Amino acid sequence: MTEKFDLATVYVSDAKYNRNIFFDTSPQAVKLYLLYNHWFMQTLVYVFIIINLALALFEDPAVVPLPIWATSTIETICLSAFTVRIIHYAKVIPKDKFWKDPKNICIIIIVTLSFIDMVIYGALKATGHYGIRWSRVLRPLLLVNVTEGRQLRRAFRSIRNALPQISYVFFLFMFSVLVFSLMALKLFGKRGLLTINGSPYFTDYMDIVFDLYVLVTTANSPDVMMPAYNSSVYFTIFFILYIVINTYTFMSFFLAVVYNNYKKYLKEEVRQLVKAKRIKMCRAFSLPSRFIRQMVHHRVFVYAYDLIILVNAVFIGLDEENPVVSNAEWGFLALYMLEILLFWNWFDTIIVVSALFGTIINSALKHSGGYTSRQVLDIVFILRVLRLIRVVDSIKRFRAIINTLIKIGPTILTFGQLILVVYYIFAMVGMELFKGKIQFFEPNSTSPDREYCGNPLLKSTSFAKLNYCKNNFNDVISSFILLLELTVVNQWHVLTSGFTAVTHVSARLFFVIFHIVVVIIIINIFVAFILEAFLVEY
Amino acid sequence: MTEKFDLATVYVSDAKYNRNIFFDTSPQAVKLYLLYNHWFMQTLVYVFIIINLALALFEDPAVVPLPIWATSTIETICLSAFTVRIIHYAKVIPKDKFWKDPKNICIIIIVTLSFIDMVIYGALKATGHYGIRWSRVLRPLLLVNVTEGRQLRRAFRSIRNALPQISYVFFLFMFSVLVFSLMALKLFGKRGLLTINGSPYFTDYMDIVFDLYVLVTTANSPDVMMPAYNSSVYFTIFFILYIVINTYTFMSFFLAVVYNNYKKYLKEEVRQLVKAKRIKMCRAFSLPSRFIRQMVHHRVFVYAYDLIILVNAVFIGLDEENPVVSNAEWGFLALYMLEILLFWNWFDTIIVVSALFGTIINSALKHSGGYTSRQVLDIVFILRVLRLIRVVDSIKRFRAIINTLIKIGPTILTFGQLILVVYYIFAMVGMELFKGKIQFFEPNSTSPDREYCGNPLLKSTSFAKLNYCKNNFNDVISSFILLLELTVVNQWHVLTSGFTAVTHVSARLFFVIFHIVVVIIIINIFVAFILEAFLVEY
Ligand code: NA
């Protein structure tokens, strides 16, 4: 009636959410909900999470060194924003189900732990303990256990359900690796002959099992077997079997398990949100020449601009800065500018107006200071070749991608932050162990400081003399890059062998665990998506 | 009646086949069918195909050099066996549908071409033409287009149907690679600065597109970007985008397409064989102490032998040939031998009797000639650690694998020869281009013959000084090994860079095409199986 109508609106206006609220009895206790779910607070909590995360750019290893008093008073207001949001949520939900939700317990827990760690990082006269801030790994868990993370903490239950099977299979896989390592130890071994390059080939077991594990990841496929294939071809059979048993059978059994669990949780996000919709949504019931320019387009006219684009991609990859081509970049700019004579019309318009910034080239190269020569060209040419993507219209296959790019569809946003929660936890953990062991040195630097590697323990390794030096964990920027080239598994064993040469050999576990959680059950949860999105879309 | 009963039997006795026969009118024209489909002829044609294939061990580059008159009179009888089988088949099927089948046209075609090439390899006074035998690539096509290859030539129609989609997607993928290569050429480029190691980084386009293609295959993930990440971190964004667009999105779109087509052809092998069954099958209608040893087993007794096995895997990986352990290998042999006091009982019995060949160790080490010391141990120890696989019973998960290993189930046999048809076609093609360019040299050989690489064009490359020398195409054995480490894609660009350094740079197409057909649409057709076999098995 006079106020139940509003309760009805707030029950119906969520044709997408999934939760229970306080059914209004005090007329401000539903206004507090309407303010809670209000888009601006929903984006304010996310920008406050992003500030809290990106605080890692400044703190212990910093790309921008900021004083501790200054990078603590930022996450003090971040944690205060989370506290004010959680007490406001408690003012929305009655004090019956607020206390039971794990999400709320976890939120107040990680806020309390971050706030206690922040002040116990009151160093107390430089008692720096050579590594602190054990709560930075809890920062990306706000991204999950926040009230708006229903799209993520649901996608975390999908993995929580996959573990009694992923581990069920990984036990068999690690047993295969361990029995194959025993088989290879009784083969070429301490009771064997051959070497690799000044090293004994397969002599100790704990190095065999790692060299055989990394062969599953095929980071060293033709090199781990090149001795003992230089010795006898019959040794090859061992690796032929190992690869087809582990690299292809097991590493695809993990994908099968991950895809099965994803496919099984998709029908329990839907059909459990659908029932979570009709609960409330149904409860509301109980609660001249101008004619010519108009007709040229719907003709052979896109074929004229699919050729002008094509001849434009030939006027790009031939530049030697001759008047033939240095002026022609202006003509093509005008040709698309008439396309302003009425998906792509959204994208196409963005590029042409951004390409009209070739005037900046005129106003910043021949005069007015040419100090920004390479930078502005590397941003206009990366933009001209972006026009080229619309030449794909000639195949009639990109007006049908905005459906595969369906409206915003936070699924690709959910994974985009799922890879962040994992990277941030490993970057934070990683950069406290290998904080400043190796370091990229400028090409003209103090060579007597051992500039060819960073520190003499990489005196002659395959990490040095391969220019891997900007892969250090010395800051969250160059530590997120490293975790990429660790994700894409090429030569992850030599990146590992550069961090187990400056630290103990046990650091091998940090990168093995990383590969297990990222490449086996995070990249596969990605392939499981663009597999599911491809088959069941009809 | 008097003979229709036999026609009825031969129509019913095939509860698994799919074909039409001659309905008997001349009483020998169905006896010829019964003899045709007779198991012995069916295995004789396959051993004759295997002889014809394995003839490559002897012919042009040989592991065993056999005279041309002698390795031609073997495939003369092989082609005669195929001719006698095809004329016998023509004597089975009436001369109406025999001539129309492609399979028959293709069989007589490849037989005629092999037989013409075999005699035109009547060299005519050493006119060797530096490479002949253009019909060896047709040898593995008998494996497909033979009458018993219905399990394979059907699995080839699955790929023939996937091509209008795999190419549909590969066009977009190669366009992405080509536009990204243009974007990287206008980036760090001839109008750029940086180098790699004495080389210019990304200057010419046809090398950028290959270095960017191989980055999709992630064979050079952290090395292709290490310069221009040693120059500016903002260049990383380019590769971060390239990898997530190509390495993970496209390379999984290929898997999605392959798996969709496999899943779509599975329901057209079944439900088209099922209708191919009820056609004929229904047409038949119209046409004391002994008590103790008996009861110890069904008790805690497998737990006693799951521990004896466990302590046996500790009595294996500690051997230093002491009397403690050199005798203990006999005791464990006896312990399992009592397990002969009544899936595994099949497998377990095989290992224990094969492990009783430790008597050969006694009769061939301490006396009677110890010239076979390493060889017989490397075959008994690879066998003891095979006992260990039954310790998996303690998890209760391998009596349920003989269902995933269902009765013979030629599907895993169909793929096992599908990888052979592809390898044999590339080994035959490959070993006629790079026949003897590089060659593995023994560790004590004529160094002045350029033994560190094989030939001076690999003077200082990453193919030499990495011990890649037994990867040559110099014989079908070491050419099938190479195509494995080409299949498992680690460092396929440096194996390529060793063959494009002895031949023209255009040889890059042989390995790019190989990766496209093996890693993209053959390994994915394998993952599509153990994905399909895992989900739809209920
Ligand atoms: Na790789």
Closest residue in B to A256 (Cα–Cα): B531
Q: What are phi and psi of A195, to 5 degrees?
A: -125, -175
Distance CA B473, CA B454 (A): 13
CA angle A251, A252, A257 (to 5 degrees): 105
Q: How far is CA A362 from CA A120, A224, B258, in A?
A: 56, 56, 50
Q: Which residues, by Cβ under 5 Å, contact ligand 1, an ion?
A: A 490; B 490
Q: Write out A390-425 in H/E/C secondary structure.
A: HHHHHHCCCCCCCCCCCCCCHHHHHHHHHHHHHHHH
In the block, which residue shows the tokens 């009458």? Answer: B147
User: Are A293 and A31 spatial neighbours (Cβ–Cβ below 8 Å)?
Assistant: no
CB contact under 8 A, A385 and B247: no
Q: At what angle do helices B373-387 and A150-186 cross, to 10 degrees?
A: 140
Which among A145, A157, A149, A88 is positioned nearest to A111, based on CA atoms? A145
Q: How far is CA B92 from CA B20, B25, B31, B48, B126, in A?
A: 10, 12, 9, 21, 44
Distance CA A534, CA A511 (A): 32
Which among B240, B254, B250 is positioned nearest to B176, based on CA atoms? B250
Tell me which DSSP letter residue B137 carries: G
Distance CA A87, CA A107 (A): 11
CB contact under 8 A, A534 and B495: no
Tell me which DSSP letter residue A188 carries: S
In the block, which residue shows the tokens 């699995």? Answer: B155
Residue B341, judged by CB atoms within 10 A of its CB (0-12, 13-18, 19+), counts as exposed
CB contact under 8 A, B233 and A481: yes
User: Are A401 and A389 spatial neighbours (Cβ–Cβ below 8 Å)?
Assistant: no
Distance CA A117, CA A113 (A): 6
**Beta carbons within 8 Å of B152's beta carbon, 6+ residues apart:** B143, B144, B414, B417, B418
Distance CA A524, CA A256 (A): 9
DSSP B402-471: TTTT-SS-HHHHHHHHHHHHHHHHHHHHHHHHSSSSS----SSS-GGGTTTTSSGGGTT-SSTTTTTTTT
End-to-end Cα distance, chain B: 43
Residue A536, sorted as left (phi over 0), alpha (psi -120 to 50) or beta, turns out to be beta
**Beta carbons within 8 Å of A206's beta carbon, 6+ residues apart:** none
Residue A264 tokens, joined = 């099984």
CB contact under 8 A, B255 and A531: yes
- Give residue A219 CA to ligand 1 midpoint distance, Å: 5
Distance CA B300, CA B215 (A): 55
Tell me which DSSP letter residue B220 carries: S
State the fold for domain B155-284.
Helix Hairpins (1.10.287)
Q: What SS3 class is residue B395? A: helix
Give the gap in angstroms from C-alpha A246 to the nearest C-alpha of chain B.
12
Helices (H) and strands (E) in chain B, counts: 22, 0
Q: DSSP strand E in A277-391: where?
A: none
User: Are A492 and A453 spatial neighbours (Cβ–Cβ below 8 Å)?
Assistant: no
Tell me which DSSP letter residue A195 carries: B
Which among A130, A475, A395 is positioned nearest to B173, based on CA atoms? A395
Ranges of each domain in chain A: 38-145, 155-284, 298-341+344-395, 410-535
Resolution in Å, one decimal place = 3.1
Distance CA B184, CA B191 (A): 11
3-state helix, strand, coil in chain A (%, to 5): 65, 0, 35
Cα Rg of chain A, angstroms = 29
In the block, which residue shows the tokens 């920027």? Answer: A477
User: Are A316 and A381 spatial neighbours (Cβ–Cβ below 8 Å)?
Assistant: yes
**Beta carbons within 8 Å of A265's beta carbon, 6+ residues apart:** A155, A157, A158, A161
Instruction: Give the CA-trace dihedral at B262, B267, B268, B270, to 10 degrees.
Output: 120
Distance CA A507, CA A434 (A): 9
Q: Does B389 touch chain A (CB under 8 A)?
A: yes
Distance CA B469, CA B393 (A): 43
Q: Does B212 touch chain A (CB under 8 A)?
A: no
Helices (H) and strands (E) in chain A, counts: 22, 0
Q: Mark which residues 451-510 of B lie under 8 Å from A by CB.
A: 466-471, 477-478, 481, 484-485, 488-491, 495
User: Are B219 and B492 spatial neighbours (Cβ–Cβ below 8 Å)?
Assistant: yes
CA angle B105, B109, B111 (to 5 degrees): 120
Distance CA A176, CA B96 (A): 55
Distance CA A478, CA A489 (A): 17
Distance CA B451, CA B465 (A): 11
Q: Does B368 touch chain A (CB under 8 A)?
A: no
User: Are A377 and A361 spatial neighbours (Cβ–Cβ below 8 Å)?
Assistant: yes
Q: How far is CA A151 from CA A103, A530, B282, B425, in A?
A: 13, 18, 55, 49
Greatest Cα pair distance, chain A, in angstroms, is 95
**Beta carbons within 8 Å of B199's beta carbon, 6+ residues apart:** none
Q: How many CA atoms lie within 13 A of B198 on its CB side?
A: 2
Q: DSSP strand E in A177-301: where?
A: none
CB contact under 8 A, B471 and A222: yes
Residue A76 tokens, joined = 């003090």
Residue B438 tokens, joined = 């590089």
Q: What are phi and psi of B27, to 5 degrees?
A: -55, -10
User: Are B220 and B211 spatial neighbours (Cβ–Cβ below 8 Å)?
Assistant: yes
User: Are A430 and A510 spatial neighbours (Cβ–Cβ below 8 Å)?
Assistant: yes
Q: Does A236 touch chain B (CB under 8 A)?
A: yes
Residue A358, judged by CB atoms within 10 A of its CB (0-12, 13-18, 19+), counts as middle
User: Are B487 and B519 spatial neighbours (Cβ–Cβ below 8 Å)?
Assistant: yes
Chain B residues with CB under 8 Å of A218 CB are 488-490
Give the gap in angstroms from C-alpha B341 to the nearest C-alpha of chain A.
27
User: Are A242 and A218 spatial neighbours (Cβ–Cβ below 8 Å)?
Assistant: no
Select the residue of A229, A317, A490 nearest B470 (Cβ to Cβ).
A229
Distance CA B296, CA B287 (A): 57
CA B66 to chain centre: 26
According to DSSP, the residues that pair with A200 across neighbouring strands are A195
CA angle B357, A208, B412 (to 5 degrees): 65
Residue B439, sorted as left (phi over 0), alpha (psi -120 to 50) or beta, turns out to be beta
Q: What SS3 class is residue B195? A: strand
Other Cβ atoms less than 10 A from the Cβ of A254: the count is: 21
Q: What SS3 class is residue B200? A: strand
Chain B residues with CB under 8 Å of A252 CB are 526-527, 530-531
Residue B354 tokens, joined = 């094969």
In the block, which residue shows the tokens 């599908």? Answer: B418
User: Are A233 and B510 spatial neighbours (Cβ–Cβ below 8 Å)?
Assistant: no
According to DSSP, the residues that pair with B195 across neighbouring strands are B200
Tell me which DSSP letter residue B507 carries: G
Residue B218 tokens, joined = 């992630």
Which among A383, A315, A374 is positioned nearest to B191, based on CA atoms? A374
Distance CA B79, CA B108 (A): 10
Residue A136, judged by CB atoms within 10 A of its CB (0-12, 13-18, 19+), counts as buried
User: Are A159 and A521 spatial neighbours (Cβ–Cβ below 8 Å)?
Assistant: yes
**Beta carbons within 8 Å of A71's beta carbon, 6+ residues apart:** A55, A58, A59
Q: What SS3 class is residue A200? A: strand
Distance CA B532, CA B263 (A): 7
Q: How many CA atoms lie within 13 A of B12 on its CB side?
A: 12
Q: Does A341 touch chain B (CB under 8 A)?
A: no
User: Are B388 and B315 spatial neighbours (Cβ–Cβ below 8 Å)?
Assistant: no
CA A485 to chain centre: 12
Q: How far is CA B63 from CA A437, B58, B284, B473, in A?
A: 51, 6, 53, 11
Distance CA A457, CA B162 (A): 52
Q: Mark which residues 286-325 of B lie under 8 Å from A by CB.
A: 313, 316-317, 319, 321
**Which amino acid type is present at position B524?**
N
Other Cβ atoms less than 10 A from the Cβ of A86: the count is: 19
Distance CA A421, CA A485 (A): 17
According to DSSP, the residues that pair with A195 across neighbouring strands are A200
Distance CA A439, CA A426 (A): 19
According to DSSP, the residues that pair with B290 across neighbouring strands are none
Alpha helices in A63-189 (DSSP H): 68-92, 102-120, 139-145, 150-186
Residue B375 tokens, joined = 């060889």
Tell me which DSSP letter residue B233 carries: G
